[PDB]
Design an enzyme around this catalytic site. Structure first.
Site, PDB file in Angstrom:
ATOM      1  N   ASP B  65       0.876  -1.186   0.000  1.00 37.49           N
ATOM      2  CA  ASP B  65       0.000   0.000   0.000  1.00 37.49           C
ATOM      3  C   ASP B  65       0.917   1.242   0.000  1.00 37.49           C
ATOM      4  OD1 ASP B  65      -2.090   1.920   0.255  1.00 37.49           O
ATOM      5  OD2 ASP B  65      -2.469   1.459   2.349  1.00 37.49           O
ATOM      6  N   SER B 142       0.965  10.612 -18.158  1.00 37.70           N
ATOM      7  CA  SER B 142      -0.322  10.780 -18.800  1.00 37.70           C
ATOM      8  C   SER B 142      -0.297  12.059 -19.588  1.00 37.70           C
ATOM      9  CB  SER B 142      -1.410  10.877 -17.742  1.00 37.70           C
ATOM     10  OG  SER B 142      -2.564  11.467 -18.294  1.00 37.70           O
ATOM     11  N   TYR B 155      -6.738  15.542 -10.782  1.00 35.50           N
ATOM     12  CA  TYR B 155      -6.026  14.453 -11.447  1.00 35.50           C
ATOM     13  C   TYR B 155      -4.786  15.004 -12.177  1.00 35.50           C
ATOM     14  CZ  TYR B 155      -4.723  10.816 -14.636  1.00 35.50           C
ATOM     15  OH  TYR B 155      -4.014   9.874 -15.354  1.00 35.50           O
ATOM     16  N   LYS B 159      -0.651  14.495 -11.877  1.00 33.22           N
ATOM     17  CA  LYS B 159       0.220  14.077 -12.980  1.00 33.22           C
ATOM     18  C   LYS B 159       1.230  15.167 -13.290  1.00 33.22           C
ATOM     19  CE  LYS B 159      -0.198  10.634 -13.827  1.00 33.22           C
ATOM     20  NZ  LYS B 159      -0.113   9.241 -13.232  1.00 33.22           N
TER      21      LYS B 159
END
Lengths: 284, 284
Positions: B65, B142, B155, B159
């Site tokens: 984790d 991304s 998000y 990134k």
């Protein structure tokens, strides 16, 4: 009415300078809420306020901790005008040292304050501006948000985070009438940066002798460009007003052009080879 | 020996595909540690492993984790070879919706997993590679880390954070012999993205009717480009091997060129006006 302005991180730096520059504008068209996480530090701001002789009531200090949403909400409960025309997301903290020498809690606070804290302020203040159909948000950027710098890994991560967070919102806000701008600051004459005077064993007992040496090299090099490049806070605070006055603002304003040649090398080569190599020689 | 490889986020997506692609390479030169946060999800990976018939012992699953440093440390205690030649920082989660509709805990997990978790892995694994004087780190990027996308604010922030974090390290690592690369992925045929089928009242009772409508517009537009642009995971996983094989790798590898014209508009104009405007029309 007056332009209600709310600024975070006003205990020093561009925040302090911007609050008093606003509150003392000769036109008296600005009411300013200068927030501090700890009021024990509000001295400098008041000594400065008296120095520019801001009229009584053009400046109010509020305790606001961007790490706490309860604190963020309370803060807006204290804005009598029941409106904020300009929100300046300025609170921000740095982090310098070999990644491996950085503590998890320290890396967490930086993102927490620089990134999540800016999200908290936007969540609390964006709706009303969207509903009124107007508002301006100025975000304090950095050239460290436009290119990576050795030994500033987590700091750059947070400034890069802001670039992404803001570019995304700007795409949506365009038709809503509210304006978001990032003021890209290079080095400015203010403590921490220039005050970097130490490098304890903590670094050494936490990294290798070869990384440590590179660190020394970086600090040395960084002391030199700060010498030849640091800007007066009054010049930088002025860039915020130029952005604040603009009829149709752009997404970015750069307080300097001095770092632009390096930024050109950056997207002249998207694979990153030209930049990583150039920056390596420019430092080491 | 074999090239010891450790990958995070292997329950699905490019992670799962990359682990089995590695473990089943015809050359048998890779030993693979595929980590999952929850072993209850390790089914897909084993069904796939059997489908490519990976030899017994070329693939081991580890519970790891990235939110917990204790878990991260334990993980490396389980690498028998006492070495990791290639570290693939893949674990990552998305977030979609109006910023104001996003919960603080959700915004926190995203940074925590995408950014801090990648820092944790680097802290645990970078020293040894620096000391051996070799190692390769591949970070799943991304196109959302290269340009901001409406409704993907947090998000993109994470990134973009990775771009900054990695560009900074790469500047230091250059002379240490260890290589860091970001594999810039556009849309790929995998659940979540394509599976975005809903838009509850939760959004509506959390935002305005005008933002909600824009959201509908975005989801609709995003469904179309994913249709015309999503890549097969096997093609993307292959980009990771091309990067992994490179004698002198670059900082970025793009799995596609399809989004490059938009990226050109981006640094052809640093003030951000051309981009914010173009992206607005391209979506709305």
């Amino acid at each position: 009415a007056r332009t209600v302005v709310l600024i975070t991180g006003c205990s020093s730096g561009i925040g302090l300078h911007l609050a008093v520059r606003l509150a003392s504008d000769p036109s008296q068209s600005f009411k300013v809420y200068a927030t501090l996480r700890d009021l024990k530090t509000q001295g400098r701001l008041w000594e400065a306020a008296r120095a520019l002789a801001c009229p009584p009531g053009s400046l109010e200090t509020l305790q606001l901790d961007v790490r706490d949403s309860k604190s963020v909400a309370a803060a807006r409960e204290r804005v009598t005008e029941g409106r904020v025309d300009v929100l300046v997301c300025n609170a921000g903290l740095g982090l310098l040292g070999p990644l491996e020498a950085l503590g998890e809690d320290a890396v967490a606070s930086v993102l927490d304050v620089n990134v999540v804290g800016t999200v908290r302020m936007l969540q609390a203040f964006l709706p009303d501006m969207k509903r009124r159909g107007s508002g301006r948000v100025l975000v304090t950027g950095s050239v460290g948000g436009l290119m990576g710098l050795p030994f500033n890994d987590v700091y750059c991560a947070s400034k890069f985070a802001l670039e992404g967070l803001c570019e995304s919102l700007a795409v949506l806000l365009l038709p809503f009438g509210v304006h978001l701008s990032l003021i890209e600051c290079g080095p400015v004459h203010t403590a921490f940066m220039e005050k970097v005077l130490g490098s304890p064993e903590e670094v050494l007992d936490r990294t290798d002798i070869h990384t440590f040496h590179r660190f020394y090299q970086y600090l040395a090099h960084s002391k030199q460009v700060f010498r030849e490049a640091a800007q007066n806070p009054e010049e930088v605070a002025e860039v915020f007003l130029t952005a604040l006055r603009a009829p149709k603002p752009t997404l970015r304003y750069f307080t300097t052009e001095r770092f632009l040649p390096l930024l050109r090398m950056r997207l002249d080569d998207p694979s990153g080879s030209n930049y990583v190599t150039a920056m390596h020689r420019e430092v080491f």
